[PDB]
């Protein structure tokens, strides 16, 4: 109604691995790259007045660096944290520590894989989850925080 | 769209949805069932998604529907409630009619009783949301609109 | 003139069966000898009970559903649903009235997955093993809650 | 001989049975399955009747209005084996033998369907062979009746 | 009737009822409710004797000492419920029928308490019903002894 | 003129205990007699029944190898062996023949470590609790998927 | 003239209820007529048996501190304190003091948590089931681990 | 008193018992063991009988021929007590009563050694009391069949 | 201090620790509990804490302590010893007093067997010291004082 | 008694997110940082002629190439892991493989939190652990590595 | 080698290696466990290593055969198949005549049923190999070379 | 028979504290080094026209990195992660990411030593695994990759 949102500051953050997408037998597996996807939410975010930071990392301790520095400069995450999700308990105590509200999102549907990979560090605080649905579900995390932020 | 073909999705809700809005609408939200499924099917309308619904306390009224499904759906969304933790019967049910569906569920199970995170629907959905609100029929919409249509 | 207290006792499935089998060798009560003691000792207090049973899950929650601010508390034999009904347990968060779970038998004496209730942990209380008295029982505590005595 | 009755009772989704992809996984109906057993029961004077549902309330409701009319049960619970102390509390009260009937091997499929909370009080369980599994049930049935 | 000779035992820390922030959790105490308790018995030719202690050998040594002098038991026995398996070998042992009562609903706190070492030998359990628990053990009890 | 089946039946330890102890307090029926019965049903449908019953592991596994491109199917009641024979699961699984377990008593009723088989998640299927007549159950099934009747 | 073994036997609680209720019924033996025959026993082997029975957790523990530098060798019977006494496994420790451990029920053939001890792992070995003897066999034991025989 | 006929069965392993490192662990073999254990047994008018085996089926059969001839059996099972469900099968078929024995504390080993198959039907177990628990089992025997 | 409050600190230790220093001193260390509650009372006496102590092997005695604190004690130091894996008779004494206190082990229950790993008392307490020996009982009166006076 | 200790070197390790410390709503949860309290500790250890140094890290590699720098020049650990305690068996075999003592401190008591916080790849091997008394469990853990060292 | 000192090794087979390139050797692979023996004694005596060799079905022989080894073999290299997963007495016969082995397996137990993760002989051998084919078979017989030459 | 290989590239990867290998208590614990048997392996590779690469490291980020820079260019991996076995979904789903054989390498016989060694994130996806043959299992690992590669 008759009034104007504040710009929302969101930060995607990506664990190991995902720099593979789109490398590996493209003709079978799919051509779509991690950047293809970043870019394609970044533009999908600044429509809505949101300013999008996106890093992907390998290294633990650059996601968690990234939490640490977000403290009182972003307003929302998204992650996929990859298999951070079931082995990194510093990354869970590092979204505690700033307080930040976030969204987990897994390209594939880990509760059809094996059965280690039905456990989650993270799932429990995460305000939601949302697994399986491609790349597609980062955008349906940014359309959530949105959401969330903006009471709408 | 006189550009794209129809898809015919079911929308399924399990025990106790019925009951979103009434008690404390002050404390715990004003949101009913209806005002939720209202709103998906004019999403769906805009893309040619030619939205049913049912929801029920009742398991065989979800199962029949199910069965009643083959060959006339394309695609489901079902928040299943608390079935997801019991009815190996659902599971056979969309086993057997053998539709790709996506679960949804409007709150974090993650975060509540332990016994809530197993599902006998998850491991074969395509795939679940949880904790996203009423949004998360939207988001299993256009996941399906973009799975059938390749886009 | 205490207020009248609605109470609402549900009793779930195979409960029908009672005093029918072999009555002579496990006893002649009924069910409806049960609910007809239990009616009049609850009118002697001014309480106002009403009763289902069923073996129909749905009818157990639909009926619940219907109790939302008309029934100060229930009384519920969930019978065989006490160990698996998840639908029933979210049924009385949802209407958030407050209950007492009974069975006849002491099932902590029987079956292993017999000890397991997706109901015991948000009742008030449990009663076990005291046959037909724990509804007399929870219906003398549910008027206790009530009248604050 | 005295007539048996016997009821053959049916758990969910086997009415889907012979419809799906009829050319690949069987053309068999559950139909085709009870109009067969009917004919095998009649020739040994076994009164066979049959309920199969997707609701287990008629289940467990047709075990009751079984008491002291039906000598023997036959069920293929379906999912409810896994999932209905409702049904096992069912047949133990009215105390009828019954024997317990799956059409697939269980134990080959997901860990969860090894589970059963009818197996421990059936007579006897038979996994894996098909539509002959009713008819074994019923010769089996008539064995025990008729001590032979 | 026969004058029924009843024995309350209660188990450890239920000597602090009423005493911490009377006003916030409840100002009735042990000594209340037993007295109470005592006063409904007498009205039913009900011989009623109380133990209270936060030592686990005088329960048992009292339960000994019941051996052909009582013709019930009822027993909190408070934390030693998930603990004392020679509070359950002695109540099998001098083979009295007994009440399990407990004020509070165990199965809504911590899960180490969902498991007793008295709940499968006892006639019954009580949980979560405050003070009135004793009460309907009691009744319980007479019904049992009389036949009502 | 249906083709002679050439089928195995295989019977683990203690079976040859069968009808010996109180035979007027637990029955008459001996292994032989079953085995009888059973050759006999079978020859009248064209089936070429052999037979070994033992205590020693290592013969029913020898018997199992001796089988390859000899015999077209196995029944097998493993008795005691279901719950400890790695090998013989190997067995069966090296050879390739389709077989079906048979117990006579029904092993979910008695302790819990029965429930557990090394065997019946590769079996065409399981028969418990019928007694002998599981027998006789398993070789109309045998014939059944082999002349796809 | 071996020297004079100084033996204490312990026993746990509910033990002191032996022979005593339904002693036709259930057999007519105390704890009492045990310990006799057994100190008579042990008399005629240069053997000075002293015995506490208590249902004190406390009694049995200050016993076995008491026992420390005068006690040559333990045999207890720790009966429900084998599941539940850590306290009593650390005094057992605490003065190294070798012991046995005696039942005399056939404790596997009970409940399951009776199969579980917190004292049979660290005893230099244990009888279940044998009655009375069990105490005499495990004097023979002491006897025969001090007398090198 | 009447004979007692009295067969004792040892487990796989067992053979070993006096060979390895003599000076180390022992120098008394199972021989030894059985020679004293016979001479015990001959003093009380008890017939003895031994088969020491590494083939589970030599035990079985062993109990199967035991059948209507033995009073009593006395066995160590060694490795066998946490694996062979056909040895429980053949004692439970033949219905004579035994003493399970092992010569070493098996609690105080790895955890999987406190499983045994044997266990609850057996009469009694006697562990880590050395070759002593054979003779312990011996009188338990008699004291049972003698009723002394 | 004829600065400070006087902190009234209660001190219980549990089954078996009576052995302390009386079996093969030569070989596990010479130390008593009395040397140690000697020493203790002496570094708390220098700081205004009056410091009471009694050792049990009977729970009873541990419990009954506990409810005489009640009002009259600002904090408790516990080993339980044994009690820890056995005794919610103890935990339900501590919640029902409502006095906080800190959990101190001499050894390190941790590279011990593993039943010792599970305590009906670590949950509950401020916190918790193992395997310092002594010293851990120092460390527990020192972490008392900093909470009680805000240092 | 009449004679004088060589100098202890000493070396305290911090885990992950305690960096974090005095940070977050300092006027809800406290004001002390991490560096407050090395501060406080390395002059309680220099007055006992204890030399203290200090890696605080978000990055389990640079916990470990510590721990191996520290062979034949250190002679007691005090190691606060954070997440780390759950997860790192690499941390464990560092510890075990240069084989100098140490004590674990943790802030707050884990026995407290999830159940999952409840299992250590260290505690059982570490000659200590202090959970629970906050900032002062590492002057404790310092005390108690002096008298071991010093058989005092 | 009138270099070295005669190393005696014993090969153990277990059940079911006999059937090794019997079923579908167009398929499933052509070798026999003749062919890899032959192979193993070849590379063994030009390594002044003398092999002997049991496969067997039956358990007993595989135990007396480790019965009769005692102060004869210097190693045992062992391919237990399916009584790795069920023999506490094979366990029992090694420790008892106290020879060093090694265990083999063809195939990677690790990728099949989860029942297979188990054995009652990996913890006490001196290493394990599995996945590695018949090549597995002279890995062991390297390692045992290495281990008792100190090369 | 009468034809010639080509050249395999072989990438050897050492996990966490392998780097300690010959440092402590040479004379009670053995002298060999991480660099001895890696240099002595290069040698056995290089005489069967195997070009063989070699990272060792503390750091998980390093030997995924490493994994993913192998894609295309390596035809086979020798992998001992030490303790990273127990605990790196991280790894194993670099390994499946680019689909490159691997048989997993462990000195010791884990089985003997903790419970929670038994467990591997790796093991399953293996070609093969060899625990507990010391050095000579990098050679056994390196002779069965050639015989896979050669099928020889």
């Given at each position: 109604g008759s009034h104007m949102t504040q710009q929302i500051k969101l930060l995607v953050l990506n664990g190991?691995?995902?720099?593979?997408?789109?490398?590996?037998?493209?003709?079978?597996?799919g051509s779509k790259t991690l950047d293809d996807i970043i870019k394609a939410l970044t533009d999908e975010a600044?429509?809505?007045?949101?300013?999008?930071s996106h890093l992907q990392?390998?290294?633990?301790?650059?996601?968690?660096?990234?939490?640490?520095?977000?403290?009182?400069?972003?307003?929302?995450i998204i992650i996929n944290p990859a298999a951070f999700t079931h082995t990194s308990v510093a990354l869970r105590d590092a979204?505690?520590?700033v307080n930040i509200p976030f969204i987990e999102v897994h390209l594939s549907n880990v509760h059809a894989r094996e059965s280690?990979?039905?456990?989650?560090?993270?799932?429990?605080?995460?305000?939601?989850?949302?697994?399986?649905?491609?790349?597609?579900?980062?955008?349906?995390?940014?359309?959530?925080?949105?959401?969330?932020?903006?009471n709408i």
């Open positions: 190991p691995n995902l720099n593979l997408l789109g490398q590996r037998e493209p003709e079978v597996y600044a429509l809505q007045n949101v300013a999008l990392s390998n290294r633990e301790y650059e996601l968690i660096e990234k939490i640490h520095d977000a403290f009182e400069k972003i307003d929302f979204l505690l520590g280690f990979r039905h456990h989650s560090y993270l799932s429990d605080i995460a305000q939601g989850v949302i697994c399986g649905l491609g790349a597609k579900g980062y955008s349906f995390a940014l359309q959530s925080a949105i959401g969330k932020l903006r």
